[PDB]
Scaffold this motif. Structure first.
Motif, PDB file in Angstrom:
ATOM      1  N   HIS A 114       0.537  -1.144   0.044  1.00 28.56           N
ATOM      2  CA  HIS A 114       0.401  -0.047   0.223  1.00 28.56           C
ATOM      3  C   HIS A 114       0.541   1.075  -0.253  1.00 28.56           C
ATOM      4  O   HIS A 114       1.468   1.466   0.806  1.00 28.56           O
ATOM      5  N   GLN A 115       0.996   1.831  -0.998  1.00 27.27           N
ATOM      6  CA  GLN A 115       1.890   2.541  -1.206  1.00 27.27           C
ATOM      7  C   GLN A 115       1.269   4.693  -1.932  1.00 27.27           C
ATOM      8  O   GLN A 115       0.335   4.629  -3.064  1.00 27.27           O
ATOM      9  N   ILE A 124       4.091   8.098   0.598  1.00 29.79           N
ATOM     10  CA  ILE A 124       4.282   7.363   1.821  1.00 29.79           C
ATOM     11  C   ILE A 124       3.689   6.049   1.487  1.00 29.79           C
ATOM     12  O   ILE A 124       3.136   5.674   0.654  1.00 29.79           O
ATOM     13  N   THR A 143       1.668  12.812   7.458  1.00 25.54           N
ATOM     14  CA  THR A 143       0.565  12.286   7.099  1.00 25.54           C
ATOM     15  C   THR A 143       0.796  10.725   8.286  1.00 25.54           C
ATOM     16  O   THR A 143      -0.146   9.754   8.669  1.00 25.54           O
ATOM     17  N   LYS A 146      -0.258  11.142  11.265  1.00 21.83           N
ATOM     18  CA  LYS A 146      -1.515  11.096  11.477  1.00 21.83           C
ATOM     19  C   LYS A 146      -2.385   8.731  11.047  1.00 21.83           C
ATOM     20  O   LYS A 146      -2.997   8.955  11.916  1.00 21.83           O
ATOM     21  N   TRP A 147      -1.482   8.688  10.362  1.00 20.68           N
ATOM     22  CA  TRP A 147      -1.805   7.414  10.583  1.00 20.68           C
ATOM     23  C   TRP A 147      -1.616   6.326  11.695  1.00 20.68           C
ATOM     24  O   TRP A 147      -1.622   5.364  11.914  1.00 20.68           O
ATOM     25  N   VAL A 152      -3.584   2.513  11.236  1.00 28.46           N
ATOM     26  CA  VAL A 152      -4.234   2.922   9.777  1.00 28.46           C
ATOM     27  C   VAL A 152      -3.406   1.474   9.725  1.00 28.46           C
ATOM     28  O   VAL A 152      -4.137   0.210   8.658  1.00 28.46           O
ATOM     29  N   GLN A 155      -5.327  -1.410  10.207  1.00 28.16           N
ATOM     30  CA  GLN A 155      -6.897  -1.523   9.566  1.00 28.16           C
ATOM     31  C   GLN A 155      -5.957  -2.729   7.865  1.00 28.16           C
ATOM     32  O   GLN A 155      -6.162  -3.150   7.524  1.00 28.16           O
ATOM     33  N   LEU A 156      -5.018  -2.024   7.872  1.00 26.70           N
ATOM     34  CA  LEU A 156      -4.937  -2.783   5.723  1.00 26.70           C
ATOM     35  C   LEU A 156      -3.976  -3.671   6.467  1.00 26.70           C
ATOM     36  O   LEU A 156      -4.414  -4.443   5.149  1.00 26.70           O
ATOM     37  N   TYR A 159      -6.856  -6.376   6.050  1.00 24.94           N
ATOM     38  CA  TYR A 159      -7.525  -6.390   4.542  1.00 24.94           C
ATOM     39  C   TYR A 159      -6.530  -7.188   3.297  1.00 24.94           C
ATOM     40  O   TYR A 159      -6.657  -7.675   3.017  1.00 24.94           O
TER      41      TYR A 159
END
Lengths: 276, 100, 9
Positions: A114-115, A124, A143, A146-147, A152, A155-156, A159
């Motif tokens: 995930h990029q 990022i 970013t 915050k992540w 975050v 969660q990724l 998935y």
């Protein structure tokens, strides 16, 4: 064999000409299976392979909803990025996002991704651990902060280890006729006089799937890497791909040259030479 | 801002045979930004109703697109692909060569 | 099948 699923997204702002255009495509290996374009008359996730068509209305509704929301979110992010980089609202900018998963023969997760990129530069990326982040600059660090605060990555990961691999396995089964069939290259060598002193030998690979391939020329069994012109693998338009490699060869020297072909559709690698 | 100029290949789906229907492809790749203009040409004139693929990109983030149309090559008909991009000071034209 | 999560930059 080993397989991948990838979703690609590009938003391009166009101040003075409406909202940013959003285009996303989904792939399994080198086969496109879905698309969505915000400039379509009636934007929706659309089928692009035979094996995804059997999915029902609920499928197409869910994917379309996600696409529509991602389009709006990308537009907020583009505005955010103008602030992070002290940029004016007059220019066109680009936000790219890729994510997906690789699985092995037994269908287990080998690797998730995930990029993001902004204006063609890495911004990022989720690390291979699916738990930590690599930020390219101080903007991206905002970013990242915050992540991290919002967990975050967790969660990724969920998935990427779960739904990404489970649906990829589903799609591989449903499209087993094409997705799990490797088409070998049709290969030959052509000869193209340049002058009295030399001619070009061009080794062709045609009609192959998947795109991954190795074409090389040797001279007296030595790799001619620096003297080989190797074109980018290119789509034929019928799902297959094409590539060639060419060397400049002194007259009368042709039989010293051999072309070598590796493709997963070939039980053994090929050796070809010019056959007049 | 960073800019990458497109690579351009123009070629047929199947080995060219005169009088035989086929497809003419123009594949543009390696470029950024994504805004690009591509025409296929027959004897210097624009072909209508040329189709293209949906914008996608490679691992290094550079974009690629395929433009394509049906065509029946012959001995004398010349085909080409014309590309315009922010990195080019003039439109770039690449002639179709059946041996490439 | 798509990621249903939207994390803002």
């Amino acid at each position: 064999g080993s397989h991948s699923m990838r979703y690609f997204h590009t938003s391009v702002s166009r101040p003075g000409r409406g909202e940013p255009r959003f285009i996303t495509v989904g792939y399994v290996d080198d086969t496109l299976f879905v698309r969505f374009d915000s400039d379509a008359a009636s934007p929706r996730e659309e089928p692009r392979a035979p094996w995804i068509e059997q999915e029902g209305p609920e499928y197409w509704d869910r994917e379309t909803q996600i696409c529509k929301a991602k389009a709006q979110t990308d537009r907020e992010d583009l505005r955010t990025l103008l602030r992070y980089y002290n940029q004016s609202e007059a220019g066109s900018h680009t936000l790219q996002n890729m994510y997906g998963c690789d699985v092995g023969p037994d269908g287990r997760l080998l690797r998730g991704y995930h990029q993001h990129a902004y204006d063609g530069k890495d911004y990022i990326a989720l690390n291979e651990d699916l738990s930590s982040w690599t930020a390219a600059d101080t903007a991206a660090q905002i970013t990242q902060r915050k992540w991290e605060a919002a967990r975050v990555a967790e969660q990724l990961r969920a998935y990427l280890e779960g739904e990404c691999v489970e649906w990829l396995r589903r799609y591989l089964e449903n499209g087993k006729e094409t997705l799990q069939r490797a088409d070998p290259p049709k290969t030959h060598v052509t000869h193209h006089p340049i002058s009295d002193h030399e001619a070009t030998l061009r080794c062709w690979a045609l009609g192959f799937y998947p795109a991954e391939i190795t074409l090389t020329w040797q001279r007296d069994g030595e790799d001619q890497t620096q003297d080989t012109e190797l074109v980018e693998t290119r789509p034929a338009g019928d799902r297959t791909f094409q590539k060639w490699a060419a060397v400049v060869v002194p007259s009368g020297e042709e039989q010293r040259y051999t072309c070598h072909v590796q493709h997963e559709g070939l039980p053994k690698p090929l050796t070809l030479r010019w056959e007049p | 801002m960073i800019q990458r100029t497109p690579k351009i290949q123009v070629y047929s789906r199947h080995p060219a045979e005169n009088g035989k229907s086929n497809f003419l492809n123009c594949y543009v790749s390696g470029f950024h930004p994504s805004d690009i203009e591509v025409d296929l040409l027959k004897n210097g004139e624009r072909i209508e109703k040329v189709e293209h693929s949906d914008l996608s990109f490679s691992k290094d983030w550079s974009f690629y697109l395929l433009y394509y149309t049906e065509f029946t090559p012959t001995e004398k008909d010349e085909y080409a692909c014309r590309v315009n991009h922010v990195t080019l000071s003039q439109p770039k034209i690449v002639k179709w060569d059946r041996d490439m | 099948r798509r990621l249903p999560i939207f994390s803002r930059l």
